[PDB]
Amino acid sequence: EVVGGGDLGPNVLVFDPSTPDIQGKVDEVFRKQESNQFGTDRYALMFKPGTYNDINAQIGFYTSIAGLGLNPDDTTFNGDVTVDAGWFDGNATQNFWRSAENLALNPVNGTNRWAVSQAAPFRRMHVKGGLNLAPDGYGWASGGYIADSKIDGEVGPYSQQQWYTRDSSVGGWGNGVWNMTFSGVEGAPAQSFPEPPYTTLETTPVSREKPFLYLDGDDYKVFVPAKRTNARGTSWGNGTPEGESLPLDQFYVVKPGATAETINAAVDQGLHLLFTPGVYHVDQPIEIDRANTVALGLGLATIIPDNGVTALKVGDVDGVKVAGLLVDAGPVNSETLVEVGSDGASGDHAANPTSLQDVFVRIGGAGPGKATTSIVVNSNDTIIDHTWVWRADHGEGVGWETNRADYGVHVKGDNVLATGLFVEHFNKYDVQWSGENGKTIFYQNAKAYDAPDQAAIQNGDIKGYAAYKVDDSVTTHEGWGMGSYCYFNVNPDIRQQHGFQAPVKPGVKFHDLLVVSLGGKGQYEHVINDIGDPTSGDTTIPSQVVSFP
Ligand SMILES: OC[C@H]1O[C@@H](O[C@@H]2[C@@H](O)[C@H](O[C@@H]3[C@@H](O)[C@H](O[C@@H]4[C@@H](O)[C@H](O)O[C@H](CO)[C@H]4O)O[C@H](CO)[C@H]3O)O[C@H](CO)[C@H]2O)[C@H](O)[C@@H](O)[C@@H]1O
């Protein structure tokens, strides 16, 4: 019974090079979206191919900006896509929930400013000049994620604490701070941790670029890249990229209105999903149990699970590409928010894996919300390529109980790969890995700030719960470029035994680990298990470990 394609709706603004009032108009969204951290408004600015002049697209909360060509240079700005921190007094550590993709940029002073923190991906971009990742004045910042991009000149992180870059091309990298990690990046600074703190891998073992809306001439369509093993450099610049096109008309177009039963019925029926920029309350989980289903969000499209249900469940099928969505906890506790595969699933998905890309989870912050576990990854071979799983530390509806969320991510399948894993503030283990031969490239954690007292975070004989816990049974794991920080702002007497916990086996390895106390609010006793120096002083110097075991 459902109906494919049709109309993307008001919240998706489709600019062209003869379109009137682009500056003034891109400027109204920012005005309302600049300081709008928890609003329900959602926007995507989409630009048709061509060259656009005298422009500076300033990007606020819940704003995605993109070109609608196939290769990034089809849509060129003699101008800038700018993220700054004027609204929060130079501090960029709340510059969340926005994105830029599939544009070239010829920045007006020779350098584009993308001063963001978490959940602010920069994908499929060509910067014909510099890329400055810090707010004007080298004030605080906690990014960040760049993939499938070419920066002609220098990337300058400056004050950025940490960063992940994959499968890209840079002609310079200026500096590290705590953890600037690279995989498959031509031009990456040579590996050197802790000095500078560069963790560098030549290729990404597998990656698959995120699907995106484009105009194959007159028609709305989505292009869906195929996977690369040992990816290095960009995917677009040599000629005809690799992967499929879907016509629009083979997508259900979800808008304000949609029930979860119709969304699933459209996937029953053989349609893909395109979530328009909106907030979707669902009282049954969204279910994708058809191989190769693309589920693509625009304008930070957001799902909220009502009645304590799970928001999104992927079945044990090959090739599901979930991209560009925020799952936002309801006030009724959900046992899970996202499940990838059913519990127990023992099959392969190796040739054609399921992935989550730019999938973000929030618990609290916009009022009261809670979940026991946020993401369960049951399916073997799953790719998690950019996720921010975040128990709110600030905002409305936040308490050590009021927005309690015990567990962030739990990985149970085998062969699972996370590139750009950001997980923070959970009451217990932020990340748990139970499956075999897991790989994590780049991890950023901060522990819960609102732990009341030592006794509240006790873990048998461990003080605190690891930010990242590989199970005792696991025989095979390997991780690179991983940091956990603490700011026990309620009770800075607290001690966190470690950032990491894992068995001591010849084939469970870690490379370039660090923990950091933020201005002496709590301290780490060790880095991993019982190994590594404690943090000390209020000077926020990392305690580091190059190699383990
Ligand atoms: O609070 C809400 C959000 O905050 C996120 O965590 C922040 C955290 O980012 C912040 O850390 C700062 C660091 O940014 C800072 O690094 C320095 C660099 O700025 C500088 O250029 O280089 C040196 C190193 O040589 C560093 O000085 O260092 C100060 C310490 O002096 C840190 O405090 O601290 C905030 C709280 O104090 C903290 O909240 C968090 O990830 C988000 O989840 C959260 O929503």
Swiss-Prot record:
Induction: Is up-regulated during growth on biomass, i.e. when the bacterium is grown on cellobiose, xylan, and various pretreated switchgrass samples. Changing residue 424 to A/Q: Loss of enzymatic activity. It catalyses: Successive hydrolysis of beta-D-glucose units from the non-reducing ends of (1->3)-beta-D-glucans, releasing alpha-glucose. Transmembrane segments: none annotated. One of its GO terms (molecular function) is glucan exo-1,3-beta-glucosidase activity. It is an enzyme of class 3 (hydrolase). The keyword Disulfide bond does not apply. Optimum pH is 6. Maintains 70% or more of the maximal activity from pH 6.0 to 9.0. Keywords: Carbohydrate metabolism, Glycosidase, Hydrolase, Polysaccharide degradation, Secreted, Signal. Optimum temperature is 50 degrees Celsius. Maintains 70% or more of the maximal activity from 35 to 65 degrees Celsius. Changing residue 449 to A: 150-fold decrease in catalytic efficiency. Changing residue 393 to N: 330-fold decrease in catalytic efficiency while only 2-fold decrease in substrate affinity. GO terms for biological process: glucan catabolic process. Its EC number is 3.2.1.58. It is found in: Secreted. Changing residue 393 to A: 1200-fold decrease in catalytic efficiency. The active site is at 446 (proton donor). Belongs to the glycosyl hydrolase 55 family. Exo-beta-1,3-glucanase that specifically hydrolyzes laminarin and laminarioligosaccharides, producing glucose and laminaribiose as end products. This is Exo-beta-1,3-glucanase.
